[PDB]
Amino acid sequence: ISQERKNEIIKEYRVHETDTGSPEVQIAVLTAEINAVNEHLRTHKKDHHSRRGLLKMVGRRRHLLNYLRSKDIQRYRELIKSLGIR
Amino acid sequence: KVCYFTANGITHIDYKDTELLKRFISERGKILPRRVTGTSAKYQRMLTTAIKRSRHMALLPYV
Amino acid sequence: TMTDPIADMLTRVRNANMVRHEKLELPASNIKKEIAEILKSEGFIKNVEYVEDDKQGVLRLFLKYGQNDERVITGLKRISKPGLRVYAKASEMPKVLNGLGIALVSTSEGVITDKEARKRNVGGEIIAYVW
Amino acid sequence: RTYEVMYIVRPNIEEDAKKALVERFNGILATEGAEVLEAKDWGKRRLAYEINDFKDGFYNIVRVKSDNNKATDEFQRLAKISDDIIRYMVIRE
Amino acid sequence: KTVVRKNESLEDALRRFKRSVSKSGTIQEVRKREFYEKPSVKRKKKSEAARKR
Amino acid sequence: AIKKYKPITNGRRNMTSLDFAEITKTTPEKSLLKPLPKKAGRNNQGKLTVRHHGGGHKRQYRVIDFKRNKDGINAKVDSIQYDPNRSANIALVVYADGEKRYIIAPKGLEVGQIVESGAEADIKVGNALPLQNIPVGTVVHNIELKPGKGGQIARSAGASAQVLGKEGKYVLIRLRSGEVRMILSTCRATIGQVGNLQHELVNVGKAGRSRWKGIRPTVRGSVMNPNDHPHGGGEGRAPIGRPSPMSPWGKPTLGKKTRRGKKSSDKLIVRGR
RNA sequence: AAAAUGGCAA
RNA sequence: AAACUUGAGUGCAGAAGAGGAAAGUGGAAUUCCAUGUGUAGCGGUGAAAUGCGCAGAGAUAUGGAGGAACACCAGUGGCGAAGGCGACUUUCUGGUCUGUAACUGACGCUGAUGUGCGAAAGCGUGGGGAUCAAACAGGAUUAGAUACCCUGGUAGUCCACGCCGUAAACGAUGAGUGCUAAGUGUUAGGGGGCCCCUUAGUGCUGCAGCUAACGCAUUAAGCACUCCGCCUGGGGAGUA
Ligand SMILES: [Mg+2]
Ligand SMILES: [Mg+2]
Ligand SMILES: [Mg+2]
Ligand SMILES: [Mg+2]
Ligand SMILES: [Mg+2]
Ligand SMILES: [Mg+2]
Ligand SMILES: [Mg+2]
Ligand SMILES: [Mg+2]
Ligand SMILES: [Mg+2]
Ligand SMILES: [Mg+2]
Numbered sequence: 015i016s017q018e019r020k021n022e023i024i025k026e027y028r029v030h031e032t033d034t035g036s037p038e039v040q041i042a043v044l045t046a047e048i049n050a051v052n053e054h055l056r057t058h059k060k061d062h063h064s065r066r067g068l069l070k071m072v073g074r075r076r077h078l079l080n081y082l083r084s085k086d087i088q089r090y091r092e093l094i095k096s097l098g099i100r
Numbered sequence: 101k102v103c104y105f106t107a108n109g110i111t112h113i114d115y116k117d118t119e120l121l122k123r124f125i126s127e128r129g130k131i132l133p134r135r136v137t138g139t140s141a142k143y144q145r146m147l148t149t150a151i152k153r154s155r156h157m158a159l160l161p162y163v
Numbered sequence: 164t165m166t167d168p169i170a171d172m173l174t175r176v177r178n179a180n181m182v183r184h185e186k187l188e189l190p191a192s193n194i195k196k197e198i199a200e201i202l203k204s205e206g207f208i209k210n211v212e213y214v215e216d217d218k219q220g221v222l223r224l225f226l227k228y229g230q231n232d233e234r235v236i237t238g239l240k241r242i243s244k245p246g247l248r249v250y251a252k253a254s255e256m257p258k259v260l261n262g263l264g265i266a267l268v269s270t271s272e273g274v275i276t277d278k279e280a281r282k283r284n285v286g287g288e289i290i291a292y293v294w
Numbered sequence: 295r296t297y298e299v300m301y302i303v304r305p306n307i308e309e310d311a312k313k314a315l316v317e318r319f320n321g322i323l324a325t326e327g328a329e330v331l332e333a334k335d336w337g338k339r340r341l342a343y344e345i346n347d348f349k350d351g352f353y354n355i356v357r358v359k360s361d362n363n364k365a366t367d368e369f370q371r372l373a374k375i376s377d378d379i380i381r382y383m384v385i386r387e
Numbered sequence: 388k389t390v391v392r393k394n395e396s397l398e399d400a401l402r403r404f405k406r407s408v409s410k411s412g413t414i415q416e417v418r419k420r421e422f423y424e425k426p427s428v429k430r431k432k433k434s435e436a437a438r439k440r
Numbered sequence: 441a442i443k444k445y446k447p448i449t450n451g452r453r454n455m456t457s458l459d460f461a462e463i464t465k466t467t468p469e470k471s472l473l474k475p476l477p478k479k480a481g482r483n484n485q486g487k488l489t490v491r492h493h494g495g496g497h498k499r500q501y502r503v504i505d506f507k508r509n510k511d512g513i514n515a516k517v518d519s520i521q522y523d524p525n526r527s528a529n530i531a532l533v534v535y536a537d538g539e540k541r542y543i544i545a546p547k548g549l550e551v552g553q554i555v556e557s558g559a560e561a562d563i564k565v566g567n568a569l570p571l572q573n574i575p576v577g578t579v580v581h582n583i584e585l586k587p588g589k590g591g592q593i594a595r596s597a598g599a600s601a602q603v604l605g606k607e608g609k610y611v612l613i614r615l616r617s618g619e620v621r622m623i624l625s626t627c628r629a630t631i632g633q634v635g636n637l638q639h640e641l642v643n644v645g646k647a648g649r650s651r652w653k654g655i656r657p658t659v660r661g662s663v664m665n666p667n668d669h670p671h672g673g674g675e676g677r678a679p680i681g682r683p684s685p686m687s688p689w690g691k692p693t694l695g696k697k698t699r700r701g702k703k704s705s706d707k708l709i710v711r712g713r
Numbered sequence: 714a715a716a717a718u719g720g721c722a723a
Numbered sequence: 724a725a726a727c728u729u730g731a732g733u734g735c736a737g738a739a740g741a742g743g744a745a746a747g748u749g750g751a752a753u754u755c756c757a758u759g760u761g762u763a764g765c766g767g768u769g770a771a772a773u774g775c776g777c778a779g780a781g782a783u784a785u786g787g788a789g790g791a792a793c794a795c796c797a798g799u800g801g802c803g804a805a806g807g808c809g810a811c812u813u814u815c816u817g818g819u820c821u822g823u824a825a826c827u828g829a830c831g832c833u834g835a836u837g838u839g840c841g842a843a844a845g846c847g848u849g850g851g852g853a854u855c856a857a858a859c860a861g862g863a864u865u866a867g868a869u870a871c872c873c874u875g876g877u878a879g880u881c882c883a884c885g886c887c888g889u890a891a892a893c894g895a896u897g898a899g900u901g902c903u904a905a906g907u908g909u910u911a912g913g914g915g916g917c918c919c920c921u922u923a924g925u926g927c928u929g930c931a932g933c934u935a936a937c938g939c940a941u942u943a944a945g946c947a948c949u950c951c952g953c954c955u956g957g958g959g960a961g962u963a
Contacts, residue, residue: 125795126795128795129795130794130795130796131795131796131797132795132796133795133796133797133798134796134797134798135798141798141800141801141909141910141911142739142910142911144796144797144798145739145740145796145801147796148795148796148797149811151795151796152749152796152810152811153811153812155749155750155810155811156748156749156750156810156811156812157749162749162750162751162794163750163751163794
């Protein structure tokens with residue numbers, strides 16, 4: 015995604031100011047990235063190499079979501095509903 | 101030798117810049133090897149893209 | 164990833180001892196410090212130094228070499244491993260090299276040599292053998 | 295994004311006709327969400343190799359800045375259709 | 388195109404022509420593409436040539 | 441675009457059909473409809489002159505603008521519709537003045553697309569220009585042989601022709617057959633290719649569906665009597681038993697050319713199919 | 714250019 | 724249960740790349756076709772012949788058509804998980820590396836079963852067809868010649884979308900991590916004075932150590948820990 019778009023995403027989901035490492039922040043950027051590649055994959059269905067990149071992001075997002083659930087159930091539930099991932 | 105581009109501190113090679121390109125092409129119009137020219141690897145790649153673009157626009161001869 | 168910190172400590176010493184390096188620096192943990200102190204006590208290693216790196220600290224172990232460039236530590240082996248843990252009762256406590264070697268054992272009392280464990284009649288997990 | 299476009303016009307074209315062509319295509323380059331930063335006519339030059347049985351051609355270079363590539367694509371379509379433009383190339387950078 | 392010099396031997400000009408052809412390496416290229424070789428083989432020969440250099 | 445029927449019956453087994461997704465309106469325009477009675481291969485004398493034509497579903501003829509002579513007025517495509525009388529689909533196009541006409545629907549034509557005809561028209565699908573104006577290497581359709589008559593070539597589904605070159609008054613084109621022929625530059629052709637490309641792939645599946653389309657059965661000459669066919673007669677199945685396969689009317693039917701000689705088109709035709 | 718073959722043990 | 728930042732991510736500032744997908748545009752060459760010139764061969768082999776040509780071939784000049792592949796650059800160069808990826812342009816798009824230390828705070832590693840990708844050949848449907856070329860046909864060779872060589876030549880070779888799921892798919896070397904002499908070349912960086920230092924690759928050489936030996940050797944086949952896959956005489960048999 016565009017750096018500007020990413021910067022908008024981080025500001026929305028940041029737990030505190032100057033936070034780029036929050037699970038919520040990282041998940042949101044991944045979610046936006048995942049959707050972007052999917053749209054590309056819809057136009058270009060034979061781009062197997064790009065899809066592999068998507069699969070890694072999906073797995074990373076899943077792993078971050080798993081960590082968040084363990085750390086805080088409320089925050090996890092807030093993130094999944096906010097990003098519409100479930 | 102020494103890379104002309106490194107020596108002259110030029111970081112961009114232009115296809116429109118025929119005169120620069122002409123130095124690094126042979127009389128047959130073949131792109132000269134980087135060893136003979138003494139150009140750096142990075143700049144040899146730039147030179148080839150510039151030469152090929154200029155050849156397309158008929159600025160440089162294919163043969 | 165690193166799965167056994169202790170095994171690495173023993174291996175570093177082994178690798179350094181092979182090339183006859185005077186000193187080694189390793190990442191420091193409380194258990195590793197205790198093992199190092201025992202080795203110095205037994206005279207296998209000459210000296211131990213600890214420093215704070217603002218992370219987990221750094222340990223410096225000074226290896227001891229006999230005359231004619233002899234090595235005091237012949238070998239180190241990790242008896243208890245992350246994959247399979249070995250625990251021994253005081254009666255079953257092992258002797259290394261017929262008592263010439265030492266066996267590091269983790270006990271309720273603390274990390275101690277095999278001889279000490281048998282003396283106190285306290286069994287423990289056998290961390291390693293050094294001979 | 296900024297794109298540099300170079301188009302070669304046929305040598306036999308009339309001077310009045312050439313002027314009409316360059317004006318049209320420069321418009322096409324700035325049609326949609328685009329600004330022409332500069333437009334420069336290199337003029338008649340000997341072609342390194344003969345193109346469309348022409349040993350010479352008029353070179354025109356135009357620099358266009360746009361957020362979209364719609365204008366450049368529009369130029370390319372019409373340039374292909376146009377008989378006058380013997381050679382054309384669009385380069386971003 | 389090599390052009391025979393004025394008041395120059397044809398054989399001398401032919402020698403100059405031969406040198407120019409050698410510089411071009413056109414003959415060499417023709418001999419390479421006389422027979423097809425497998426794509427892997429081409430890379431191997433190229434690598435071997437580089438090792439020779 | 442092909443719907444493959446599951447083998448619920450032996451008749452439906454192997455039967456395929458078009459999805460008909462492209463069709464937007466299922467109803468024809470009342471004004472542009474004219475009656476089309478069936479002839480069943482019967483001439484003015486009333487006798488059968490072309491065999492295997494008869495029956496079939498009733499059809500109303502749709503009026504189509506093959507001429508594409510309305511110039512300078514832009515037309516917006518209202519709908520793509522199913523025409524019973526042709527392999528291609530047809531497009532209801534409404535001109536700015538308010539005239540509604542049908543045209544052969546080009547491939548990639550969409551509802552709301554604007555189409556224009558004339559010399560000044562842009563080279564985009566659905567636009568009809570004189571051949572001279574059309575660039576070389578352009579796929580074209582609905583090509584007029586005679587100027588002003590209306591397009592007679594490349595009207596079928598998935599049909600196109602390519603402009604090859606200009607030769608004075610004439611323009612060279614390659615037809616789908618593979619024939620290269622000269623056509624007057626004044627003649628027009630629509631830009632693009634005709635749609636309904638998957639029409640050929642359809643598997644009719646059963647005999648009855650052929651009967652719906654007005655095709656009556658074909659009896660082979662071999663299974664006829666001598667008086668009926670040259671291939672007729674014989675005890676049991678018979679081989680052709682003649683130097684060549686023959687037509688029902690006693691003319692050789694394999695490889696024998698039939699184009700009439702001394703035709704003006706012969707000079708126009710450069711390369712045969 | 715062509716250019717085949719040679720019992721098993723000892 | 725509560726802390727920490729080294730691992731692992733994220734930000735920010737940079738770098739290189741035949742990484743991938745979709746369109747568009749070039750030039751060389753091959754083949755075929757049409758004419759001009761011209762003439763008795765051309766072509767091919769060890770030598771021949773088939774073949775082609777005298778109904779004007781081959782060659783040469785000009786023009787057109789069409790497909791395929793991109794000379795030079797080009798490099799133990801680069802990129803990718805692997806298979807692979809070499810004209811140029813644009814659009815869409817993945818990964819990696821350097822620096823900094825914003826942030827997060829062990830969120831890691833491996834990975835049964837699964838789930839995808841996967842050379843070439845092959846298969847289905849539609850298209851295309853220049854070159855090359857299984858099969859097939861002449862010629863030759865030979866004791867024979869179902870070959871090797873020669874002249875042709877179909878599928879295939881190409882495109883799209885499915886299918887197949889295998890290759891000495893190889894580094895015959897699973898993945899993650901740490902440690903253990905040096906010398907030298909090169910690719911993309913970083914820092915400090917042509918030199919030095921440093922990071923991630925990619926080669927060569929060579930200790931300690933290892934190894935049945937050959938060899939490997941900071942790109943381990945050395946020394947260690949975790950996890951997975953796999954083997955336990957040959958043949959029968961990758962068969963029933
Ligand atoms: Mg019939
Ligand atoms: Mg009968
Ligand atoms: Mg009869
Ligand atoms: Mg009969
Ligand atoms: Mg019979
Ligand atoms: Mg024998
Ligand atoms: Mg294949
Ligand atoms: Mg052959
Ligand atoms: Mg296998
Ligand atoms: Mg290195």
